Amino acid sequence: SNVVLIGKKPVMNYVLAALTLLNQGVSEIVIKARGRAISKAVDTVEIVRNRFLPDKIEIKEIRVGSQVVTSQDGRQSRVSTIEIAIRKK
Amino acid sequence: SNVVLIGKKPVMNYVLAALTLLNQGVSEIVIKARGRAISKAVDTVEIVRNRFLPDKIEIKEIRVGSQVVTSQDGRQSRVSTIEIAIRKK
């Protein structure tokens, strides 16, 4: 895969999922998140490139967007999204 | 100035601050935010470029980072940051 979707789980979960990938051959991953989890998506990247692989990781690209979603009622609503692709420097 | 710092105020405040700038000669602004407000910084940009100036605005650049801050105790702590620069297409 190589995609880490930020969910409702505590940050450490994702920085671990993230490190596991990298420190395992994978040279590039993509942190994806939407809604309020967007905050956590950046937190995940900073923690990764900061207290775990400082100087060995670079942000290759960052995309922000909106995605229409269908709620339980069947009603449409949109949420913001972020995509942070990073790779071993 | 041309910088819109996302604070604790409701989104509309910032999308208005943002539109006011643009729809007023300013062709490029920078949405800055840190911490949990990062979510709202994207929400602000999407709402702006979506239900207000669709097709007339483009993301010129997005930077994510960390910033060490000094708390009340005088203790140091860092928070994630985001910088979304956008300009009239």
UniProtKB/Swiss-Prot annotation, chains A, B:
Single biological process term from Gene Ontology: chromosome condensation
Residue numbers carrying Deamidated glutamine: Q24
Compartments where found: Cytoplasm; Chromosome
Modification N5-methylglutamine, positions: Q67
GO MF terms, alphabetically ordered: double-stranded DNA binding; identical protein binding; nuclease activity; RNA binding
Residue(s) carrying Aspartate methyl ester: D43, D73
Gene Ontology CC: chromosome; cytoplasm
Major subcellular location class: cytoplasm
Record PTM text: Acetylated. Acetylation at Lys-8 by the Pat acetylase decreases DNA-binding affinity. Deacetylation at Lys-8 by the CobB deacetylase increases DNA-binding affinity.
Outcome recorded upon mutating K9E: Decreases DNA binding affinity. No significant effect on acetylation
Positions bearing N6,N6,N6-trimethyllysine: K8
Site (Not acetylated by pat acetylase): K9
Enzyme class: hydrolase
Binding-site list for RNA: K8, K9, Y14, R34, R36
Modification type N6,N6-dimethyllysine: residues: K8
Pfam family name, one: Alba
Signal sequence interval, chain numbering: none
EC number(s) recorded for this UniProt protein: 3.1.-.-
Residues recorded with modification Deamidated asparagine: N23, N50
Coiled-coil boundaries: none
Keyword Signal: no
Residue numbers of Glutamate methyl ester (Glu) PTMs: E61
Residues modified as N6-methyllysine: K8, K32, K56, K89
Protein family (similarity comment): Belongs to the histone-like Alba family.
Descriptive protein name: DNA/RNA-binding protein Alba 1
Provenance organism: Saccharolobus solfataricus (strain ATCC 35092 / DSM 1617 / JCM 11322 / P2) (Sulfolobus solfataricus)
